[PDB]
Amino acid sequence: SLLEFGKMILEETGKLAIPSYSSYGCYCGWGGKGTPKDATDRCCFVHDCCYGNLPDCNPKSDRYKYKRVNGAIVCEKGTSCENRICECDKAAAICFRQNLNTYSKKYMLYPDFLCKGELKC
């Protein structure tokens, strides 16, 4: 679920998902069009694609379980949708962690008109 993803993001990065990742660049929080602005925004682009891989799942609301094995995120077995959603979220949280070194506050609340053109998954 979105709330679970937000907790995973905070655990991983120390940033609150709202507002650090809810309106960032072209793809974080309301993704659709544009060239991703930076590596963090590319995490969101890929995460959007990952959810797009699951048209008959409901990643905003469906809850999954996971645990930590010495820092590592381990998705625990639920329904097929839950497992796949968890793997998408895990990857994005890791990606955000890997790209904190270039996170830029200037991309928070990024205006829609600066995001143009389709980019295929």
């Binding site: 979105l2 809810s22 929080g29």
Partner: peptide
Amino acid sequence: AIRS
């Protein structure tokens, strides 16, 4: 309320 609705995040990432």
